[PDB]
Amino acid sequence: LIDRVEEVREEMDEAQEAARFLQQHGSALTKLEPMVAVLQSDPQQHEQL
Amino acid sequence: WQSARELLRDWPSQRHLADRVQPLRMRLSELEQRLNNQQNAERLLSEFCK
Amino acid sequence: WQSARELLRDWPSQRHLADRVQPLRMRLSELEQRLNNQQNAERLLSEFCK
């Protein structure tokens, strides 16, 4: 009565959704990852800084 | 900034677990075939019991 | 710096995959019993067919 097929199916749902998100926003995340730090500095906040 | 940090935190996990879909796919195919066999065995057991 | 970035890229994968240990342990046990039954059946077949 393992009934793990439901658990494995949930894992598939999560993992296929992850793959779909990778396809959807893979390029955007790759372009964001090398210059993420900029988000911490907002132009006017640079003067207030 | 915080949203981007969280997104870059999750994204490697997403990439890490995406490849497991296909290994998971055969896993559930085998598991469900096993469950079909288990259901058949249970049905046949009950069938003879009487 | 590059090594640090690589290490913190590993850390997401490291924890996520390390979480997989125990489910794989039962899978290994099941597969071991499968192999044992395989050898048992093969042996019995050989002795009969002799």
Q: Which two tokens stand for residue A45?
A: 């906040």
Nearest by CB: B18 against A3, A15, A36: A15
Task: Please note each residue after which chain A is broken, C-to-N distance over 2.5 A, or write none.
Answer: none
Around B10, how many Cα atoms within 13 Å sit in the side-chain half-sphere? 14
Around B45, how many Cα atoms within 13 Å sit in the side-chain half-sphere? 6
Cβ atoms of A22 and B18 within 8 Å: the answer is yes
Q: Nearest 5 degrees, angle CA A45-CA A27-CA A13?
A: 110
Distance of CA B4 to the CA centre of its chain: 30
Question: What whole-number distance in Å separates Cα of residue A9 and Cα of residue B24?
Answer: 8
Which residues of chain B have a CB within 8 Å of the CB of C13? Answer: 12-13, 16
Question: What whole-number distance in Å separates Cα of residue C9 and Cα of residue C2?
Answer: 10
Question: What whole-number distance in Å separates Cα of residue C1 and Cα of residue B37?
Answer: 55
Per the CB < 8 Å rule, is B12 touching C12? yes
The label of the residue with tokens 């009969």 reads: C48
Per the CB < 8 Å rule, is B8 touching A33? yes
Residue C1, SS3 per DSSP: coil
Distance of CA C16 to the CA centre of its chain: 16
Per the CB < 8 Å rule, is B18 touching A36? no
Nearest-Cα distance to chain B for A47, in Å, is 18
Per the CB < 8 Å rule, is A4 touching B31? yes
Question: What whole-number distance in Å separates Cα of residue A35 and Cα of residue C25?
Answer: 41
Nearest CA in chain C to B10: C12
Residue C18, SS3 per DSSP: helix
Q: Which two tokens stand for residue A28?
A: 């955007």
What does DSSP assign to residue A37? G
- Helical H runs in B1-50? 2-18, 21-49
Amino acid at site B29: S
